[PDB]
Each structure stands twice: as C-alpha cells, then as structure tokens.
Design a protein around this ligand. Structure first.
Ligand SMILES: CCCCCCCCCCCCCCCCCC(=O)OC[C@H](COP(=O)([O-])OCC(O)COP(=O)([O-])OC[C@@H](COC(=O)CCCCCCCCCCCCCCCCC)OC(=O)CCCCCCCCCCCCCCCCC)OC(=O)CCCCCCCCCCCCCCCCC
Ligand SMILES: CCCCCCCCCCCCCCCCCC(=O)OC[C@H](COP(=O)([O-])OCC(O)COP(=O)([O-])OC[C@@H](COC(=O)CCCCCCCCCCCCCCCCC)OC(=O)CCCCCCCCCCCCCCCCC)OC(=O)CCCCCCCCCCCCCCCCC
Ligand SMILES: CCCCCCCCCCCCCCCCCC(=O)OC[C@H](COP(=O)([O-])OCC[N+](C)(C)C)OC(=O)CCCCCCCCCCCCCCCCC
Ligand SMILES: CCCCCCCCCCCCCCCCCC(=O)OC[C@H](COP(=O)([O-])OCC[N+](C)(C)C)OC(=O)CCCCCCCCCCCCCCCCC
Ligand SMILES: CCCCCCCCCCCCO[C@@H]1O[C@H](CO)[C@@H](O[C@H]2O[C@H](CO)[C@@H](O)[C@H](O)[C@H]2O)[C@H](O)[C@H]1O
Lengths: 11, 97, 37, 43, 188, 101, 92, 313
C-alpha cells in the first residue's frame, strides 16, 4: 500500500 | 492532603469546568474536518429538532378522499406528488381553514 | 470457585516446599544467610 | 532575521485570503456528505 | 503488528562523550555553575525540584542539546536573565540526552526550550521556536513575560488560584509510564 | 501528445500554486489565531513513541493504593498488623444470616 | 596509500549498527528497591525507525556538504581531483 | 486474574505483555480487518509518512537543514511555513527540469530506487573527498586555508589583500596553509560560497548540470534560513562545530576524533614560512599532487564501491 506518489488532497 | 485553606469547592468546580472546556476545544481543533463538524453540530441539531417537535407539538395523519382533490405540487421541489397518510405537525391555535 | 481452586492448588504446591517462605519476586527483602560465604 | 527569507514569499492576494477564510479546498462538504452517507450505511 | 527492537550498545552508550579540544589559535577568530543556575544531571534532582521547589517558588528550566547552535547562542543571555531574576525564581539547566525523563516530563519536542513551572501543573509555560523565526532575545522576553504572569497569579487571591491540575491524579503516567514504580503500583 | 501533457503538468502546477497561496492564507488568518495554547493538551504520549523511548509499561490492570498494602509481600514478618488480623478473622465465612435478612 | 589511510578506516567502520534502527532507551529497575527505576539511553521524539533505517546516513552527509561549502568559500580548487576523475556530473 | 497457582510467574507476565501488544495492534494498525482505521481523510503523522515515503524524505531533509539537528527531534507535524517553502522549491526545481526536458528529451526523438542510489553515491563521494583531504590535513582547517599551487595562493591571498601569514609542514603534508588576519578569519554565506564555486568552475570550463546547480542553490537557501549564525558560534571554529553536530552513534566518530586530534597536535607545532619560500615549493607540491590525483582513480577501485568504480571508468 505504501507508495512514492502523493495525491492532491494529501499534498 | 485533601483541600486547601482559603480555597472553595466552588472555585474548584469552576477550575474543573475550565479544564474540561479547554480540553474539549483542543480535541475539536485537532480533529478531522470531514467528521467533527457533522458529528458535533448537524446530527445533534437534527436530532434535537426532531425530538423537540415530536415531544412538544401534536401531529395529524391527513388523507384525501379523491384524486381530483389532490393539490398541485408539481412546482415545489422534493415533493412532486401528494401521498395520503401524511404526518402534519400543527400549532394549538390552528383552525380548519 | 476460581479463588477456591487457586487456593486449593497453592496449598499443595507451597505449604510443603521449604523453599518458598514467600514469593521469589520478593526474596530481596529476606535477611541474608549466615551460612553462605 | 533567520526566517525572513522564507516569510517574504508569503504574500497573499485579497481573493486568496477570502478563499482561505471560506476554506475552499480544506472543508470539503462533499467529503462531509460522503462520511455521513457511509456512517449511516454502517448501521 | 508493530514492534521496535529493544535497543543497541550504541543507543545505550554514553550520549555525551568527550571530544578533542583545539590549541589557542583556532579559538582566535573574528567573532571572538555560573553562581546563579543549577546544572541538572539526575532525574532524582529534577523530581526533587519539580515537586518541592516548584511548589515553594517558580522554576525556569532550559532544556538544550550539544548539537544545537541555538542553545549555545541562548546560553549566555539565559545566564544573564538568571543573574537578574534569581531572587524570584530558581533556574535549572538540563541536557535532554543526559536526563531524558526530564524532557519527557516537560513535554519538550524541540531544543532549545524554556519551561516556566509552578506546582508542576498549575503554571507550565513552554517557550520555543518550532518554526525558526524567533531569536534568543525574543525567547528571553517571552520567558520574562511568563515569569511576571506566574508571579502575579501567585500573589493573586491570597496565594491560591494556582493549584495542580491533571497531575493531581495522572502522576504523569500517560506521559512516562515509569511513574508507576514511583507510585508503588504493581507491574506484574 | 508531448505538448498537451507538458501543458497539463504546467496547469497542474499553477493549481498547486493557487492551493498553496490559499493554504498559507487560511493558516495565517484563522488557525494561527484559533490555535490552542497547550495548557489543556492531551496528558499522554502515544504507545509507539513510548516504546521507542523505552518507557512503556504494560502490566497491573489493578493497583494497590496504600503502601501498607504494597509492601505486604515484602515484609515477610508482619503482612498484616495485629489489629488488621483481628479484623480479618471476622470474615472467615460469608454471612448467610446477613444475606437472608 | 598513506593518503588513503582514512579511506581504509572508513571502509573498516562500514556497517556498524546505530540508534536509528532501534529504540533509544531501556528501563532498569533496582532489584533492591523496585520503586527506583533508571532510563539508560538517549532522548527521542521519533518512531519511524522502520523508515529511517535506510536513510540513517543523510544527517552526516548533509553535515559534510555544509563543511565542504565552508571550505570551498575559501578555496574552490579542492574538488578539482574528482572533477577531473569524472565522478561528478559535469559538462566539459 | 487467572485462577492459577502463581499469577506473578514469568510465563504469565510474558503472556500478558504479548496479549497487550496484540490487542493494541489489532485495534490501531491499518490492516485488512480494521477496527479503528476508518473514515480517514486527514491522516496523522505516522500513517501519513508510512504511506507517503516521498514526503518523509523531503520533510526530513528540510528539517535537518532548516534546523541543524538530529532525527530524534523530528517534529510530529511540520509547520505550514516549512510546507509552503517546500512547495515553492519543488515548483522551481520542476520548472527547470521540465524546461530542460522539453528542450532535450523530445528533440532527441520507480523513483525510490533512483533516489536511494543517488543519495548513496553522493554520500560515498563526499566521504571519499573528506578522506582524501584528511590524508593531507586539508579537510576542516579553519581559519587556515590550504593551498597546493601558486594560483590558489594568489587567489586566497587576495582575500586579505596580501596580509596574513603562511605555514608549512615537512615533506609529509603536501600543501601549505595560509592564515588571514583575525578580522577576516570569518566564514562566508552559503549563497556566496556556491556562487564562488560555480564561477570558478565555469571559468575553468567545467560547469555542473543545471539540475545539480538548482539543488545546490536550494540547499544554500534553506541554510540561509538559519540566520546569522548558520554554522558556527562566535567563539567557535568549523572543526569544533563539526564535532559538535556529529552524530555520536555514527561509526566514523572515532575516525574523525583521531583525525582532529592529530591535526591539532600538528598545527600546534607547525612552522611559519614566508611567501616566496612556498611558490618554489608549491611547484613540486602541484607535481606530486597531480600524481596523487591520477593515482586516486585507481585507488577508488581498491576499496571504493562499484558505483564509484564504474563512474571512474
Ligand atoms: C447544543 C449543541 C450540543 C453539541 C455539543 C456542544 C458542546 C457541549 C459540551 C460537550 C458535550 C458532550 C460531551 C462529550 C464528552 C464525552 C465524549 C467525547 O467525545 O469526549 C472526548 C473528549 C476528548 O477525549 P480524548 O481526546 O479521546 O482523550 C483525552 C481525554 O478525554 C482527557 O482526559 P483527562 O486527562 O483530561 O481527564 C480524565 C477524564 C476522563 O475522561 C475520559 O477519558 C472518558 C470519560 C468517560 C466517559 C463515559 C463515562 C460513563 C460512565 C458511566 C456512568 C455510571 C455512573 C454510575 C454512578 C453510580 C453511583 C450511584 O475525566 C473526565 O473528564 C470525565 C469526568 C466525568 C466522568 C464521570 C464518570 C463517573 C465518575 C464520577 C467522578 C466524580 C465527578 C467528577 C468530579 C470532578 C471534580 C469536580 O473527552 C474530553 O474532552 C474529556 C472527557 C469528557 C468529560 C465531560 C465534559 C463535559 C460534558 C458535559 C456533558 C453535558 C451535556 C449536557 C448539556 C446540556 C444540554 C441541555
Ligand atoms: C431509605 C434510604 C434509601 C434506601 C437505603 C436502605 C438501607 C441501605 C443503606 C445503604 C447501605 C447500608 C449503609 C449502612 C451500613 C453500616 C454498616 C456497615 O458499615 O457495613 C455493612 C454491614 C456490616 O458490614 P461489615 O462490618 O463489613 O460485615 C459484613 C458481614 O461480615 C457480611 O459480609 P459478607 O461478605 O458475608 O456479605 C454477605 C452477603 C453474602 O454474599 C452475597 O452477596 C452472595 C449472594 C449475592 C446474590 C447476587 C447479588 C446480586 C446483587 C444485585 C443487587 C441489585 C439488585 C436490585 C435491588 C433490588 C433487589 C430486589 O450477603 C449480603 O449482604 C448481600 C445481599 C445482596 C442483596 C440480595 C439481592 C437478591 C439476590 C438474589 C440472588 C438469587 C437470584 C435468583 C432468584 C430466584 C430465587 C428462587 O452489612 C451490610 O449491610 C452489607 C451491605 C449489603 C450491600 C449489598 C452487598 C453489595 C452488593 C453490591 C450490588 C450492587 C449494588 C450497587 C449499589 C448502587 C450503585 C452504586
Ligand atoms: C447527585 C447524584 C450523584 C450520584 C452519582 C455521582 C456519584 C456520587 C458522589 C458525588 C459525585 C461527585 C464527586 C466529586 C468528587 C470530586 C471532589 C474533588 O475534590 O474534585 C477536585 C476539585 C478540584 O479541587 P482544586 O483543584 O480546586 O483544589 C484541590 C487541589 N488538589 C486536589 C490538588 C488538592 O475539588 C472540588 O472543588 C470539589 C469538586 C466536587 C464538587 C462538585 C461535584 C461534581 C459533580 C457535578 C458535576 C458538574 C459540575 C458543575 C456543577 C455546577 C453546580 C451549579
Ligand atoms: C446509562 C448511560 C451509560 C452510557 C454513558 C452515557 C454518557 C457517555 C456517553 C459517551 C459515549 C459517546 C461518545 C462519542 C463521542 C463522539 C463525538 C466526537 O468525538 O466527535 C467526533 C470527532 C472525530 O474526530 P476525528 O474524525 O478526527 O477522529 C475520530 C476517530 N477516528 C480517527 C477513528 C476517525 O471527535 C473529535 O475530534 C472532537 C471530540 C471532542 C469534542 C466533543 C464535542 C464538543 C465540541 C465542543 C467544542 C466546540 C468548539 C467550536 C470551535 C469552532 C472553531 C474551531
Ligand atoms: C440554554 C438553555 C436551553 C434550555 C432549553 C430551553 C428550550 C429551548 C427551545 C425553546 C423553543 C421555543 O420556541 C417555541 O417552542 C414552542 C414549542 O415548540 C412553540 O409553541 C408551540 O407549543 C406551545 C404549547 O402548545 C404553544 O406555544 C403552541 O402550541 C405552539 O406554538 C413556539 O411556537 C416556539 O416559538
């Protein structure tokens, strides 16, 4: 589940 | 050592209430905006309104004999048709007219 | 009943040991043996 | 000053401060409605 | 499932070892006890202070760490503030790595940190710069203001109005569970 | 393709700048004024941070309030005073008489 | 060789464990007085060890970068060896 | 409590501890059978950084640079000022990179691993440079300034305008040190340092890449954010500052301590030498220094990592 990309809401 | 001389149990109550309110404000501040506003204002408010209206006012189930007597609710939104058996809350001074 | 069973086992397993004057976790509080050196 | 170099970049517009006061991208009433719906469905 | 390995010899080693000192030439640069404070090195001393002296008269504790340069910058002005207001309050100098339980107690998250304490929960005001905008002078001014406030409140209402709060029943157990031993509660 | 995707990125970053400006404004207007002092903060630390600090304790779902009760198993000679022993001897059995009454 | 003495020392001390992969403290209770308990270790307000165990080196790396900047502010010709060797990303 | 004969036994204690941990985990942890993880739109620090490893790295590097400190003081939630500055720096870097890509990659016709490799290679490079300099006591020697050529001698003498002294060591130290005047023994700002470095490199004809240049500039900016005293205290030197900020649990702690001890005990007895007496010496120093630099490439294959080896080849 962990990722290297951050979404817009969690920026 | 319970209690201190010169201080009053009422002052202690006031201090405790202040602590509780400050803690509540801190916990509300450090919370999710998606859930706290709803769960703290909108559900309580609606529940309060519903309970108060039910336990204070008095309601009536209204029916109509024929369909030709039904009202015209085509324009107003959220109710485009009459349904018999409708719960209607009224005030004690309301008349038939 | 749970307490009864616990005490009933404590009896058999402690009262005739000669090694459990108390619980081992508190042996630091016992006096020191004059025979050891 | 230590942080003046960074705090100089923080100059907002009138519309920006109004939008912040209103909380456009931080209140998310759609998120609130989604939460309410999910919470009621969880019954 | 969540776990953290217990510890290592490195972590348990001395956090404050000695380092070589230079000769009297490197010290020659362009920018070139204390009888008023108490350097704390023991949680016993810290607790004695917080539980007796903080109830008698207020205390001001500076929590620092060697790696920090803000602490070196703030040390001297803190010593001057101590020499100034040593009659009204006590002054302590704490290192977080040498006495961590004192830092956990005061709820310090960044260094350096001033902490004004009276009653251990009656007036605990923490001054720090979590952003990095303030300076030593600003921190010392905030500390003076907090000390003035606590003294005024202590004089207010015949000495009362400053009573311990949650620490009266928490004993700082949620902050540091090791206070259960102090209180004598079991751990089995 | 290339041009459209690069322009998409550029407008994404424009939106990011707008979001950042409104974020700064929201904070420095509302939240820096409504921020709690910290006096009424939560009087506890998370168990994970305690475990990392080496401070967590897990046991004693119960407790012993008085030192007289704490040091019983350590005294080994007078776990209960004489008066306490005499008081305890009155509860060797439950009182079915009191129960019935 | 004697110049790379320090490189040899660094390579010797290569994979020694640190505090960034484990807890920073441990409690020890005095057996004679269980009411007395000591905390051996350091301070930490940090719990993301399962992530920092892989970047532990960044602290000293950035320290070295700052020190290199300080030295280069006086003499920038100290890096020329690596530039000539072709280690850094450069456009001759 | 269980109805066993000895509830205070180690078996019972350990069982209680394991049950405690398992309960707390089953309740709080993010799993496929979650109890408490629900209605999540704004995550706390721990879960946020566990899910977004990119932000943990950025938020951590910014903390170590903006505030020279240890990871053990990493804040629970960062300030909005820091977040905004990070966003601005990201905008800058990505603008530069996007322009360069537009102009090169199209005319031509897993980020975690790449970042890990980049950081590992960079730390190895800086460690190797530090070792090379410590080989001749040129790593951290302030207020002194090392010199290995007459050009550099003149360049660093132009600092104090010919004033100051020059010191030497005998045939084992392959460079000569320069002491400016006490009023000019200061340290320079990081932006000025980066500008000087880039100017010298571009004058020599060896400019860095634009991305790396922007990286250096942002590093210097976040360092400037510290304020007046960004690296050293008033009555402090760079070596003392390094030993101060050095992580104690670092394996190289004893190595650096030994180096600084030796450097101190050498500079304490170092001899003084005039200006003209060094230039003739600086010639042979430059000769043997270029020889050692040529040998360095092979020396990297001796103990350096495969990355350094392949990049040297
Ligand atoms: C109109 C719009 C309405 C919308 C709302 C608007 C705002 C109104 C106010 C809010 C009202 C809602 C209250 C919600 C609070 C609880 C739920 C919650 O979310 O809290 C989370 C919130 C945050 O908690 P957290 O973030 O999870 O962790 C921090 C801890 O809470 C931090 O803990 P701590 O370290 O700071 O201190 C420990 C804490 C512990 O709190 C807790 O952690 C949990 C508390 C347990 C809650 C449920 C307990 C139910 C127990 C069963 C009762 C059985 C009694 C049997 C008696 C038999 C004897 C005959 O102590 C307490 O505060 C609890 C005290 C009361 C417990 C009483 C139980 C009996 C014991 C009696 C003790 C002696 C009396 C007290 C004397 C004090 C000295 C004067 O909790 C708190 O902030 C403090 C706890 C709440 C205390 C009560 C606050 C006052 C509430 C007033 C209610 C009156 C409403 C009526 C208004 C009038 C309408 C007409
Ligand atoms: C008008 C004003 C307002 C009204 C107030 C009226 C007057 C009361 C004032 C307040 C109390 C007295 C104040 C002055 C006392 C001064 C003397 C003194 O200091 O010591 C006391 C005085 C002497 O004390 P002592 O010096 O220490 O020596 C004591 C003796 O050594 C003996 O010690 P022991 O260890 O041998 O204990 C003997 C015990 C023996 O141990 C036992 O209790 C075993 C049996 C327990 C039965 C199950 C318990 C269920 C409890 C439910 C309670 C609520 C029920 C609802 C209430 C209405 C029930 C119809 O027997 C009992 O005394 C307890 C009887 C409990 C009531 C029986 C309820 C019926 C049970 C039905 C079971 C069968 C179900 C199947 C039915 C089908 C049949 C065909 O003795 C007493 O008065 C004992 C007090 C009894 C209180 C009840 C026991 C505690 C149970 C707690 C239940 C939960 C209540 C929650 C309270 C409310 C919430 C906060
Ligand atoms: C009425 C039916 C009740 C039945 C169910 C409740 C259980 C029955 C037992 C009584 C319940 C109350 C027990 C209170 C125990 C607290 C005593 C105490 O010392 O607390 C510390 C406080 C604070 O003390 P202090 O901090 O100011 O000074 C002392 C400091 N130490 C402790 C360090 C020495 O002391 C008090 O001032 C007394 C508080 C209790 C009196 C109020 C009762 C609380 C219940 C009502 C809640 C609503 C409050 C607002 C009321 C407004 C009235 C208009
Ligand atoms: C015989 C009866 C026995 C039964 C006991 C009866 C009495 C006790 C019953 C209590 C049980 C029910 C308790 C449920 C409480 C849930 C409410 C709640 O926590 O809220 C949801 C929110 C949810 O927060 P959250 O969404 O961030 O996280 C919740 C949990 N997770 C993480 C899993 C999602 O909780 C809060 O954060 C705030 C709670 C404290 C505030 C309580 C409301 C009063 C607020 C007044 C302050 C107003 C300030 C306004 C300022 C405006 C400007 C900023
Ligand atoms: C902070 C303290 C708060 C404590 C709680 C106080 C109560 C707050 C709610 C009061 C509501 C007042 O508002 C009023 O409510 C009553 C009851 O619904 C309504 O009154 C209604 O019931 C009463 C009883 O027959 C009659 O007036 C009439 O039949 C009808 O109009 C009023 O039309 C409305 O104006």
């Amino acid at each position: 589940k962990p990722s290297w990309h951050v979404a817009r809401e969690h920026r | 050592p319970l209690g201190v001389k010169g201080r009053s149990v009422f002052a202690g109550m006031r201090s405790f209430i202040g602590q509780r309110l400050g803690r509540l404000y801190d916990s509300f501040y450090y919370s999710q905006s998606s859930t706290k506003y709803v769960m703290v204002f909108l559900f309580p408010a609606g529940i309060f309104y519903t309970r108060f209206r039910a336990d204070t006012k008095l309601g009536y189930h209204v029916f109509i004999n024929e369909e030709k007597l039904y009202p015209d609710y085509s324009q107003n939104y959220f109710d485009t048709k009459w349904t018999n058996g409708r719960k209607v809350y009224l005030d004690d001074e309301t008349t038939v007219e | 009943g749970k307490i009864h069973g616990a005490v009933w086992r404590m009896k058999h397993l402690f009262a005739t040991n000669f090694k459990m004057v108390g619980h081992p976790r508190y042996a630091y509080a016992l006096p020191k043996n004059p025979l050891l050196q | 000053r230590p942080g003046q170099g960074s705090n100089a970049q923080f100059q907002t517009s009138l519309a920006d401060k109004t939008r912040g006061l209103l909380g456009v991208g931080f209140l998310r009433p759609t998120k609130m409605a989604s939460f309410a719906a999910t919470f009621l469905l969880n019954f | 499932s969540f776990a953290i390995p217990p510890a290592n010899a490195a972590a348990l080693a001395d956090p404050l070892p000695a380092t070589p000192t230079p000769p009297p030439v490197f010290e020659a640069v362009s920018s070139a006890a204390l009888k008023n404070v108490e350097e704390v090195s023991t949680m016993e001393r810290y607790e004695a202070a917080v539980y007796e002296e903080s109830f008698k008269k207020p205390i001001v504790c500076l929590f620092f760490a060697r790696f920090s340069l803000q602490s070196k910058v703030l040390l001297q002005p803190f010593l001057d503030f101590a020499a100034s207001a040593s009659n009204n309050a006590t002054f302590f100098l704490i290192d977080c790595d040498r006495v961590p339980r004192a830092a956990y107690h005061a709820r310090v998250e960044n260094v350096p940190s001033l902490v004004v304490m009276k009653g251990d929960d009656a007036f605990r005001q923490t001054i720090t710069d979590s952003v990095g905008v303030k300076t030593a002078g600003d921190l010392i001014q905030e500390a003076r203001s907090a000390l003035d406030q606590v003294l005024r409140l202590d004089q207010q209402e015949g000495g009362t109005k400053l009573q311990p709060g949650v620490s009266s029943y928490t004993h700082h157990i949620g902050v540091d569970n090791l206070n259960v031993y102090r209180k004598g509660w079991p751990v089995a | 393709i290339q041009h459209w995707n690069k322009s998409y990125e550029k407008q994404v970053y424009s939106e990011s700048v707008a979001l950042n400006r409104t974020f700064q404004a929201r904070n420095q207007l509302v939240l820096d004024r409504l921020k709690p002092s910290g006096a009424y903060r939560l009087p506890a630390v998370d168990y994970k941070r305690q475990l990392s600090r080496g401070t967590l304790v897990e046991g004693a779902d119960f407790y012993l309030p008085t030192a007289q009760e704490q040091q019983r198993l350590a005294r080994h000679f007078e776990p209960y005073s004489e008066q306490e022993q005499e008081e305890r001897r009155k509860f060797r059995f439950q009182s079915i008489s009191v129960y019935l009454a | 060789a004697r110049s790379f003495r320090w490189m040899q020392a660094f390579a010797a001390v290569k994979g020694k464990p640190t505090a960034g992969s484990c807890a920073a403290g441990t409690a020890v209770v005095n057996p004679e007085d269980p009411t007395k308990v000591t905390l051996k270790g350091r301070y930490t307000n940090f719990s993301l060890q399962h992530i920092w165990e892989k970047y532990d080196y960044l602290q000293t790396h950035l320290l070295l970068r700052e020190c290199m900047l300080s030295q280069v502010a006086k003499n920038p010709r100290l890096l020329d060896p690596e530039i000539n060797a072709g280690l850094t990303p450069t456009v001759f | 409590q269980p109805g066993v004969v000895d509830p205070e036994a180690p078996q019972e204690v350990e069982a209680f501890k394991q049950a405690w941990h398992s309960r707390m985990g089953k309740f709080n942890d993010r799993s496929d059978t979650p109890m408490l993880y629900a209605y999540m739109n704004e995550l706390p620090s721990w879960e946020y950084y566990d899910l977004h490893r990119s932000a943990f790295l950025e938020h951590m590097t910014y903390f170590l640079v903006r505030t020279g400190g240890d990871f053990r003081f990493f804040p629970e939630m960062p300030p909005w000022q820091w977040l905004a500055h990070m966003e601005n720096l990201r905008f800058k870097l990505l603008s530069v990179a996007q322009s360069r890509r537009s102009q090169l990659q199209l005319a031509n016709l897993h980020g975690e691993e790449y970042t890990q490799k980049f950081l590992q290679y960079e730390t190895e490079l800086f460690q190797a440079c530090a070792a090379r300099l410590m080989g001749h006591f040129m790593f951290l020697c302030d207020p002194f300034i090392p010199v290995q050529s007459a050009e550099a001698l003149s360049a660093v003498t132009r600092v104090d305008n010919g004033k100051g002294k020059l010191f030497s060591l005998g045939d084992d130290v392959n460079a000569l040190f320069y002491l400016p005047e006490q009023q000019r023994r200061d340290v320079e700002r990081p932006t000025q340092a980066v500008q000087t470095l880039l100017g010298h490199l571009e004058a020599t004809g060896r400019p860095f890449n634009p991305c790396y240049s922007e990286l250096l500039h942002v590093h210097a900016e976040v360092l400037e954010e510290r304020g007046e005293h960004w690296l050293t205290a008033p009555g402090e030197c760079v070596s003392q500052a390094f030993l101060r900020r050095l992580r104690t649990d670092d394996p190289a702690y004893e190595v650096y301590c030994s180096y600084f001890k030796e450097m101190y005990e050498r500079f304490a007895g170092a001899k003084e030498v005039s200006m003209e007496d060094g230039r003739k010496r600086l010639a042979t120093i430059e000769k043997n220094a270029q020889e050692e630099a040529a040998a360095y490439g092979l020396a990297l294959k001796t103990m350096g990592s495969a990355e350094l080896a392949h990049k040297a080849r």
